[PDB]
Amino acid sequence: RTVFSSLTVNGVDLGQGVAVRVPSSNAPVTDIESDDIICNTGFIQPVSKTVAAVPAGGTVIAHFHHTSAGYVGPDPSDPLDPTNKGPVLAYLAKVPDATQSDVTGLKWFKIWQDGYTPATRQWGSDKLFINGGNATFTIPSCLQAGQYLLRVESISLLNAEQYPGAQFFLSCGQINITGGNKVQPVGVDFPGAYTSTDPGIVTDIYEVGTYTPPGPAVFSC
Ligand SMILES: *[C@@H]1O[C@H](CO)[C@@H](O[C@@H]2O[C@H](CO)[C@@H](O)[C@H](O)[C@H]2NC(C)=O)[C@H](O)[C@H]1NC(C)=O
Ligand SMILES: *[C@H]1O[C@H](CO)[C@@H](O)[C@H](O)[C@@H]1O
Numbered sequence: 001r002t003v004f005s006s007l008t009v010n011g012v013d014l015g016q017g018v019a020v021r022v023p024s025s026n027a028p029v030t031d032i033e034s035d036d037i038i039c040n041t042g043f044i045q046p047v048s049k050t051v052a053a054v055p056a057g058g059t060v061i062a063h064f065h066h067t068s069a070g071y072v073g074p075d076p077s078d079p080l081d082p083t084n085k086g087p088v089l090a091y092l093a094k095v096p097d098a099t100q101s102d103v104t105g106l107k108w109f110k111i112w113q114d115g116y117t118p119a120t121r122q123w124g125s126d127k128l129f130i131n132g133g134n135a136t137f138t139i140p141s142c143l144q145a146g147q148y149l150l151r152v153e154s155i156s157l158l159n160a161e162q163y164p165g166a167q168f169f170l171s172c173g174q175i176n177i178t179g180g181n182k183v184q185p186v187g188v189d190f191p192g193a194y195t196s197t198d199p200g201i202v203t204d205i206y207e208v209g210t211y212t213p214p215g216p217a218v219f220s221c
Helices: 124-130
Strands: 003-009 052-055 059-065 088-094 108-114 134-138 146-156 167-178
Touching: 003 052, 003 146, 003 167, 059 146, 059 167, 088 124, 088 134, 108 124, 108 134, 124 146
Parallel strands: 052 167
Antiparallel strands: 003 059, 059 134, 088 108, 088 146, 146 167
């Protein structure tokens, strides 16, 4: 179990819970057809009304930790339980207002992921563990400036040999992309992008040879 609960933007740490809708617990989302798949559920109130300014091309860290509290000292399951092999993914969706409560009907484009490297037997979850929960990626430099949600997700495939079984740990950050250009990428629906037939979601980690994370191809400029 893990929770995304804070951001760093071009090396500036914004603070615990700032600009993130933090779920109350590290319990997983398990239903890919639920609206909970979009941004999780049961947010800590009052939800942050900070919308982080991030230049297009900027480096963001989405910070995962074992619990909703963030860093609370040594913990062998922080940032995640390293037995829980699986991918890490990040998506953006353009939104009218990054503080708006309704997150349905948005169009999500993937900007980064890390799946599995067969030759090293290393998962994205392993890299996220090594890096202290710091899921680090750049915002595409060509994007249309304005308000976006930043959906960052750790999937545990430990029990994913059937569906349901995959455990989805995710939150949405609230950002305002500055600078940039005029690209408005094609996105996918949540729910909808993930299905029970996706081998990225139904996988036996002790039978894995090759692996492809679920959802669309990564967008690039
Ligand atoms: C993950 O990112 C965090 C947050 O930036 C790093 O913590 C900071 O480390 C810097 C550089 O040493 C310090 O100046 C900050 O005060 C730290 N921030 C906080 C909130 O404590 C952390 O080192 C990174 N972890 C790894 C493995 O890279
Ligand atoms: C944000 O910062 C990283 C270094 O942490 C760069 O690699 C990236 O290009 C962006 O400038």
